[PDB]
Enzyme design. Sequence first.
Site, PDB file in Angstrom:
ATOM      1  N   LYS A  59     -16.773 -24.082 -40.521  1.00 45.63           N
ATOM      2  CA  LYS A  59     -16.279 -23.629 -39.230  1.00 45.63           C
ATOM      3  C   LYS A  59     -17.433 -23.050 -38.431  1.00 45.63           C
ATOM      4  CE  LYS A  59     -12.568 -23.974 -36.934  1.00 45.63           C
ATOM      5  NZ  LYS A  59     -11.527 -25.029 -37.015  1.00 45.63           N
ATOM      6  N   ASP A  76     -12.936 -28.237 -31.266  1.00 47.83           N
ATOM      7  CA  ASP A  76     -11.896 -27.255 -31.542  1.00 47.83           C
ATOM      8  C   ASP A  76     -11.593 -26.576 -30.208  1.00 47.83           C
ATOM      9  OD1 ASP A  76     -10.303 -25.795 -33.791  1.00 47.83           O
ATOM     10  OD2 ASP A  76     -11.252 -24.149 -32.714  1.00 47.83           O
TER      11      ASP A  76
END
Length: 416
Positions: free
Chosen positions: A102, A142
């Site tokens: 991430k 994202d």
Amino acid sequence: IDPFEMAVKQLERAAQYMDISEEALEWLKKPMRIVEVSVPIEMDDGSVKVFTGFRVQHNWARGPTKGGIRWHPAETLSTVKALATFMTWKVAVVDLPYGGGKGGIIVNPKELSEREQERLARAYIRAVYDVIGPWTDIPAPDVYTNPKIMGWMMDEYETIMRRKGPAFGVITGKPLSIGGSLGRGTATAQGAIFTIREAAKALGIDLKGKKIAVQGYGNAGYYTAKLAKEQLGMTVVAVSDSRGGIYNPDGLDPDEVLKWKREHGSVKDFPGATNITNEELLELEVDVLAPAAIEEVITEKNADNIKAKIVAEVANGPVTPEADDILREKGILQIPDFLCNAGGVTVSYFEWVQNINGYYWTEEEVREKLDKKMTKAFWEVYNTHKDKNIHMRDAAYVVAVSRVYQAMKDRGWVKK
Ligand SMILES: NC(=O)C1=CN([C@@H]2O[C@H](COP(=O)(O)OP(=O)(O)OC[C@H]3O[C@@H](n4cnc5c(N)ncnc54)[C@H](OP(=O)(O)O)[C@@H]3O)[C@@H](O)[C@H]2O)C=CC1
């Protein structure tokens, strides 16, 4: 409370249903590598502003870490760590040769121009270059990141790498011109539709003509409703957004609602539909409920009011842990979030495979492969749920953590 602490608590609560050594649990409870960098860009006024960037690689026992980059003013390293931990389980549950990663930048992208955004993407790549790569860590879009930013980042990475290897495979979600993949825009909704179709088979329910209510009307929710209407043959009766919702017992047309929303901002006051709220949409008598807007919409204060047979967790963490037991008590089959919305990462994996193979697939092949993968993952999770008499969330954790633990044991990382 702290997102990373909640992720660790979910892992620990799930670990009671599986035989994992404590050393492996302690290994899995902390990310293996965390990178925090300064991201300087030249603003349009000529000043230099330094942003805080994040790059978390939770675990790479099964392969290179996978996870998107989010640009948000409220972005926190704790949130990045929690999302990387969840990415590990998400890639493990659909049997991908990936680990969990991430990234994030603390930035308000709405205050940046196009040139400033491109500079920010290129600076982030120049700063996190040494810990990313086609076989190391593959980012993706994202929150507040899009295929355009992905293309900028890929170009910067290729410039730094001197085209020595496949630079397309360093990042997924890029435009089709520079090594993009067909079927990326509907990946999450398509995977959710596959899981809902398999759940109906598990419950022995024929979905041709049943009702579905979708909360959220972004990329995920609108396509979820569209594909549920056309592929599953269902009747969409309620959609909502951040403003409010609408209701129509006869049915709603996703394309018409989308056109109305693009014109008046929201879906409210749609012609020929009762106006409702987000809270009333969840408690509506439907066959499938698909919350795809935000997290923690179903809590212990409204779980007794859910009357849908199947809850499709398209969003990330839309149901609290305390509401899971209440939903299971009433007899409701719930599809866990990191299983329901795994189609996006599965199609990202397909894009990465096409990039590293130099050969690109057609839409039908991508959809067929996604169908196989999602069906197999769902049936594994559901069979684990049935045999062990545990919650579907717990069963999905049992499936994913078992794979990660076996990979860690085979590498020799943990001896017990
Ligand atoms: N690739 C994907 O699509 C993936 C999606 N997810 C999850 O699905 C969710 C949505 O995904 P995506 O479609 O991309 O997101 P978008 O940002 O494109 O859309 C989110 C939607 O949620 C609505 N919404 C926001 N706040 C509320 C609220 N308080 N009550 C009701 N509706 C609200 C928004 O309405 P409005 O337009 O008015 O703001 C919008 O329609 C996220 O939680 C995401 O993490 C999971 C994995 C991947």
